[PDB]
Amino acid sequence: GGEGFHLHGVQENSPAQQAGLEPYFDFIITIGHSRLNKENDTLKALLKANVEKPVKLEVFNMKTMRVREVEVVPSNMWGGQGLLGASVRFCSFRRASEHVWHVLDVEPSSPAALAGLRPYTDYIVGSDQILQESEDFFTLIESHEGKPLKLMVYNSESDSCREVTVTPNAAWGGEGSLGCGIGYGYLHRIPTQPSSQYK
Annotated binding site for Zn(2+): 6, 8, 91
Is the Cβ of residue 106 or residue 141 nearer to Cl ion in the bound state?
Answer: 141
CA-based nearest residue to 79, from 8, 15, 25? 15
Cβ count near 48 (within 10 Å) = 11
CB of 9 to Zn ion, least distance (A): 10
Q: Does 6 bind Zn ion (CB under 5 A)?
A: yes
Spatial CB neighbours of 30, under 8 Å, sequence gap ≥ 6: 36, 57, 58
Residue 102 binds which entry of Zn ion, Cl ion, none, CB below 5-8 Å type-dependent: none
- Dihedral sign of CA atoms 102, 105, 111, 114 in order: positive
Cβ count near 37 (within 10 Å) = 14
Say how many residues touch Zn ion, by CB under 5 A: 4
Residues engaged in binding Cl ion (CB under 5 A): 91, 95-96, 99
Give the binding range for Zn ion (CB under 5 A) out of 5-13, 139-147, 173-181, 189-197: 5-13
Give the binding range for Zn ion (CB under 5 A) out of 94-102, 112-120, 136-144, 165-173: 94-102
